């Protein structure tokens, strides 16, 4: 019993978190009321990782829903699977965070964070052997970014020997709500560098480009973006939710994927991304899964080197042919894999495929090309900060300009650390 405690913070965090629980509940046979109605015992073998079992054979997600506004969480409670969540795990305020990291992290969020930790502690106490936490949030807003990183710091203080994993949505001017998103993201990235063991970088720029270029959607919505996120999150947690030998818990995943503590930011990928009845072959799954157009971080892998790679194939397929194609991609493009980490590409296979797909493949790369994402944010940060533009929103909450300068320096240090291992 290796339980994970799930936390979703802010608008983006709760909308993507709600879809994640909607997707994996279907995969595990859990209906919107928490009653199991599946046809395979594989669905319940590792069900306790994410679900609590209550009276009446009811399965309750081990999920805590956090926001500084009630709006999005009211939509969740009215959503498809809204009634499945534990009612006492809705922790919300009323003021909102105004897309302001300082409000989430220092003022408005500080007033609410203790009541969230009370719910975290209650869920942790009912864990046979808690292995760690996963957080869904965006970095561009105020609650998910500012209060989310505040939560991560206080959770690390109370559970210093547990793994912290995040799905962190990176802002992009292509899909932007406010101009201060680079400020909020830069402040949050340093928090993640220090206080997470694994972070999946979900870039809204990549999600838009995939919807537009590949899926041929002229006007992508936040719903279309969250479809790619939902499918990716199911794929990267399959090894946690179903029986397997590789990266079966959060700590073993970290040991395999993180050669240096600060370089723990992963580029996810998914295949297929189809705009739909045609069967997809193992060579096609393997080629698309490594294609830049299937990456969720808007970084070109050929501009960097893979430190480690995990690949997960779902569905009934030839495991021999999977190995042949996986060993084919490595042995044909071995210049993009570091030579000082032998056998750094690990492959796993799960029999149960996602809903509506005969087979699929999920990519998890620790690539030095992720420095392109942080460089992009850093340039957008500096373009405003050199003129101190929009800073009054933050100094009005008690912050000083020096904390911005130190955040700017910290992320440029992170970029430089990726650059030394690329050479």
């Amino acid at each position: 019993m290796r339980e994970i405690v799930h936390i979703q913070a802010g608008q983006c965090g709760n909308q993507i978190g709600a879809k994640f629980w909607e997707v994996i509940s279907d995969e595990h046979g859990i209906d919107p009321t928490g009653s199991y109605h599946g046809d395979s015992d594989l669905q319940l073998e590792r069900i306790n990782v994410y679900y609590n079992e209550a009276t009446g054979n009811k399965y309750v997600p081990r999920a805590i829903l956090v926001d500084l506004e009630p709006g999005t969480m009211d939509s969740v409670r009215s959503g498809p699977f809204g009634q499945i969540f534990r009612p006492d795990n809705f922790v919300f305020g009323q003021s909102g965070a105004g897309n302001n990291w300082a409000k989430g992290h220092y003022t408005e969020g500080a007033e609410l964070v203790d009541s969230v930790l009370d719910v975290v502690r209650k869920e942790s106490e009912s864990c046979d052997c808690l292995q760690g936490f996963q957080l869904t949030h965006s970095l561009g807003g105020g609650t998910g970014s500012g209060m989310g990183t505040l939560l991560i710091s206080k959770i690390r203080e109370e559970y210093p020997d547990r793994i912290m994993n995040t799905f962190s949505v990176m802002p992009s001017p292509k899909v932007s709500d406010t101009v201060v998103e680079p400020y909020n993201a830069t402040l949050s990235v340093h928090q993640l560098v220090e206080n997470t063991d694994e972070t999946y970088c979900i870039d809204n720029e990549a999600l838009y480009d995939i919807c537009f270029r590949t899926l041929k959607l002229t006007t992508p919505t936040y719903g279309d973006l969250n479809h790619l996120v939902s499918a990716t999150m199911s794929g990267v947690t399959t090894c946690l939710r179903f029986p397997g030998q590789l990266n079966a818990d959060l700590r073993k995943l970290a040991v395999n994927m993180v050669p240096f503590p600060r370089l723990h930011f992963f580029m996810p990928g998914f295949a297929p991304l189809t705009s739909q009845y045609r069967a997809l072959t193992v060579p096609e799954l393997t080629q698309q899964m490594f294609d830049s157009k299937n990456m969720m971080a808007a970084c070109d892998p050929r501009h960097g080197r893979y430190l480690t790679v995990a690949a997960i194939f779902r569905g009934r397929m030839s495991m021999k042919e999977v190995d042949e194609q996986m060993l084919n991609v490595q042995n044909k493009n071995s210049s993009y894999f570091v030579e000082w980490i032998p056998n750094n590409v690990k492959t796993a296979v799960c029999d149960i495929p996602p809903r509506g797909l005969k087979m699929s493949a999920t990519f998890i790369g620790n690539s030095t090309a992720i420095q392109e994402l942080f460089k992009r944010i850093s340039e957008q940060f500096t373009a405003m900060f050199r003129r101190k533009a929009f800073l009054h929103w933050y100094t009005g909450e008690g912050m000083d300009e020096m904390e911005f300068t130190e955040a700017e320096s910290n992320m440029n240090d992170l970029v430089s650390e990726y650059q030394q291992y690329q050479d």
Partner: protein, 54 residues
């Protein structure tokens, strides 16, 4: 090619064939290392809580 030391029993036999002649730390010391490593884990955790307290 010499067969030596042939022993036979109900369940088998064994022999040797020659083709050519020729031409700890104490219980205390272990506990010290285990405790020295535990102390380094306690020092690293205290430095973390100190960092988080700041």
């Amino acid at each position: 090619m010499e067969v030596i030391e042939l022993n036979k029993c109900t369940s088998g036999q064994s022999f040797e064939v020659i083709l050519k002649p020729p031409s700890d730390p104490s219980l205390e010391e272990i506990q010290k290392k285990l405790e020295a490593a535990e102390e380094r884990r306690k020092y690293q955790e205290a430095e973390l809580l100190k960092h988080l307290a700041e």
